[PDB]
Amino acid sequence: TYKYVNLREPSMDMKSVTDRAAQTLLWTELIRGLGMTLSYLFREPATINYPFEKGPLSP
Amino acid sequence: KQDMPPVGGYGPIDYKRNLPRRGLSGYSMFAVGIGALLFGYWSMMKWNRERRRLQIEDFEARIALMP
């Protein structure tokens, strides 16, 4: 069937521009999003120590 | 006879796409910016004027001697 993605007209009123004005000017974007999704560093590194450890196979 | 298809136990996982964790929007921002900015200016005039008081004190010792 259908789906129309990335197809949405803007708000264009008094208050909702302040959500798009604080975004560009003071960067509430790009740090709450992209500075937190990188860190996300505390997870365990899933590395195989190849001369000692070995991975799975199949019969 | 030992084939796969299980009787039950299913989800699924979503095809959904959403994480609107906002986030102090809509005039709540620009409010913590301005007040903390003038707070830094409020920290002035109690230090520069205070150092200005010591600045005349520093020049005082120069003028009192030197005859």
Coordinates of all heavy atoms in Angstrom, one line a residue, chain B residues 49-65:
Chain B
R49 N 34.6 46.9 41.5 CA 34.6 48.1 42.4 C 35.4 47.8 43.7 O 36.0 48.8 44.2 CB 33.1 48.4 42.7 CG 32.9 49.7 43.5 CD 31.4 49.8 43.8 NE 30.6 49.8 42.7 CZ 30.3 50.9 42.0 NH1 30.8 52.1 42.4 NH2 29.5 50.8 40.9
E50 N 35.4 46.6 44.2 CA 36.2 46.2 45.3 C 37.7 46.3 45.0 O 38.5 46.8 45.8 CB 35.8 44.9 45.8 CG 36.3 44.5 47.2 CD 37.7 43.8 47.1 OE1 38.0 43.2 46.1 OE2 38.4 43.9 48.1
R51 N 38.0 45.8 43.8 CA 39.4 45.9 43.4 C 39.8 47.3 43.0 O 41.0 47.7 43.2 CB 39.7 45.0 42.2 CG 41.2 44.8 41.8 CD 41.4 43.7 40.7 NE 40.8 44.1 39.5 CZ 39.7 43.5 38.9 NH1 39.2 42.5 39.6 NH2 39.2 43.9 37.8
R52 N 38.9 48.1 42.5 CA 39.1 49.6 42.3 C 39.4 50.3 43.6 O 40.2 51.2 43.7 CB 37.8 50.2 41.7 CG 37.9 51.7 41.4 CD 39.1 51.9 40.4 NE 38.9 51.2 39.2 CZ 38.3 51.7 38.1 NH1 37.7 52.8 38.2 NH2 38.2 50.9 37.0
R53 N 38.7 49.9 44.7 CA 39.0 50.4 46.1 C 40.5 50.0 46.5 O 41.2 50.8 47.1 CB 38.0 49.8 47.1 CG 38.2 50.3 48.5 CD 37.1 49.6 49.3 NE 35.8 50.1 48.9 CZ 34.9 49.3 48.3 NH1 35.2 48.1 48.0 NH2 33.7 49.8 48.0
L54 N 40.9 48.8 46.1 CA 42.3 48.4 46.4 C 43.2 49.1 45.4 O 44.4 49.2 45.7 CB 42.4 46.9 46.3 CG 41.6 46.2 47.4 CD1 41.7 44.7 47.2 CD2 42.1 46.6 48.8
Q55 N 42.7 49.5 44.3 CA 43.6 50.1 43.3 C 44.0 51.5 43.7 O 45.2 51.9 43.5 CB 42.9 50.2 41.9 CG 43.8 50.6 40.8 CD 44.9 49.7 40.5 OE1 44.7 48.5 40.6 NE2 46.1 50.2 40.2
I56 N 43.1 52.2 44.3 CA 43.5 53.5 44.9 C 44.4 53.3 46.1 O 45.3 54.1 46.3 CB 42.2 54.3 45.2 CG1 41.4 54.5 44.0 CG2 42.6 55.7 45.8 CD1 40.0 55.1 44.2
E57 N 44.1 52.3 46.9 CA 45.0 51.9 48.0 C 46.4 51.6 47.5 O 47.4 51.9 48.2 CB 44.4 50.7 48.7 CG 45.2 50.0 49.8 CD 45.5 50.9 51.0 OE1 44.6 51.8 51.2 OE2 46.5 50.8 51.6
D58 N 46.5 50.9 46.3 CA 47.9 50.6 45.8 C 48.6 51.9 45.4 O 49.8 52.1 45.7 CB 47.7 49.6 44.6 CG 49.0 49.0 44.2 OD1 50.0 49.2 44.9 OD2 49.0 48.2 43.3
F59 N 47.9 52.8 44.7 CA 48.5 54.0 44.3 C 48.7 55.0 45.4 O 49.5 55.9 45.3 CB 47.6 54.7 43.2 CG 47.7 54.1 41.9 CD1 46.6 54.2 41.0 CD2 48.8 53.3 41.5 CE1 46.7 53.6 39.7 CE2 48.8 52.7 40.3 CZ 47.8 52.9 39.4
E60 N 48.0 54.8 46.6 CA 48.2 55.6 47.7 C 49.6 55.5 48.3 O 50.2 56.5 48.7 CB 47.2 55.1 48.8 CG 47.3 55.9 50.1 CD 46.9 57.3 50.0 OE1 46.0 57.6 49.2 OE2 47.5 58.1 50.8
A61 N 50.2 54.3 48.3 CA 51.5 54.1 48.9 C 52.6 54.8 48.0 O 53.6 55.2 48.5 CB 51.8 52.6 49.1
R62 N 52.3 54.9 46.7 CA 53.2 55.6 45.8 C 53.3 57.1 46.1 O 54.4 57.7 46.1 CB 52.9 55.3 44.4 CG 53.7 56.0 43.4 CD 53.3 55.5 42.0 NE 54.1 56.2 40.9 CZ 53.8 57.3 40.3 NH1 52.6 57.9 40.6 NH2 54.6 57.8 39.4
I63 N 52.1 57.7 46.3 CA 52.0 59.1 46.4 C 52.4 59.6 47.8 O 53.0 60.7 48.0 CB 50.6 59.6 46.1 CG1 50.3 59.0 44.7 CG2 50.5 61.1 46.0 CD1 48.8 59.2 44.3
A64 N 52.2 58.8 48.8 CA 52.6 59.2 50.2 C 54.1 59.3 50.4 O 54.5 60.3 51.0 CB 52.0 58.1 51.2
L65 N 54.9 58.4 50.0 CA 56.3 58.6 49.9 C 56.6 59.3 48.5 O 55.6 59.7 47.8 CB 57.0 57.3 50.1 CG 56.8 56.1 49.2 CD1 57.7 56.0 48.0 CD2 56.9 54.8 50.1

